[PDB]
Amino acid sequence: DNRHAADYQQLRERLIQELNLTPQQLHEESNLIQAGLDSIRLMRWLHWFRKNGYRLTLRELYAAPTLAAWNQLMLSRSPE
Ligand SMILES: *P(=O)(O)OCC(C)(C)[C@@H](O)C(=O)NCCC(=O)NCCSC(=O)c1ccccc1O
């Protein structure tokens, strides 16, 4: 399978570090932009997973800010 999808696990955990909350109290079905998530965090994300060959632009992440959709945006997104 895609072993790099584990990068999502570190993603999920990483927001928690900045959000100062537990990985249980995060809403991946709700919008993460409802939490303390600015664009520098967001632009960081692109670059951060891009190193594993993840391809996505900025706006799909904004359109559906949910890890549920972001995981799709990671693995396939839609090529480039
Ligand atoms: P961030 O706010 O700095 O956003 C960085 C982007 C928008 C990707 C850059 O293009 C940029 O040069 N900075 C513009 C900063 C600014 O004034 N804010 C615009 C945000 S538009 C948007 O869709 C968005 C993105 C992320 C968080 C909140 C938000 O409203």
Question: For the chain, how many structural domains are there in total?
Answer: 1
Taking CA atoms, 59 is separated from 6, 43, 56, 63, in Å, by 23, 11, 9, 6
What token pair was written down for 34? 């409802």
CATH number of the domain to which 17 belongs: 1.10.1200.10
Measured in Å, residue 39 CA sits from the centre of ligand 1 at 5
Domain that holds residue 53: 1-80
Determine whether 45 is exposed, middle or buried from the number of CB atoms within 10 Å of its CB (0-12, 13-18, 19+). buried
d(CA 60, CA 66): 10
User: How many C-beta atoms surround the C-beta of residue 70 within 10 A?
Assistant: 23
**Contact criterion met (CB below 8 Å) for 15 and 34:** no
**Contact criterion met (CB below 8 Å) for 71 and 4:** no
Q: Which residues contact 53 (CB under 8 A, 6 or more apart)?
A: 4
Q: Whose CA is nearest to atom 2 of ligand 1?
A: 39
Element holding 76 (H helix, E strand): none
d(CA 65, CA 75): 16
Looking at residue 3, the DSSP 8-state letter turns out to be G
Q: What ligand 1 atom has the least distance to the C-alpha of 59?
A: 23
Give the residue from 24, 42, 25 showing the smallest Cα distance to 33.
42
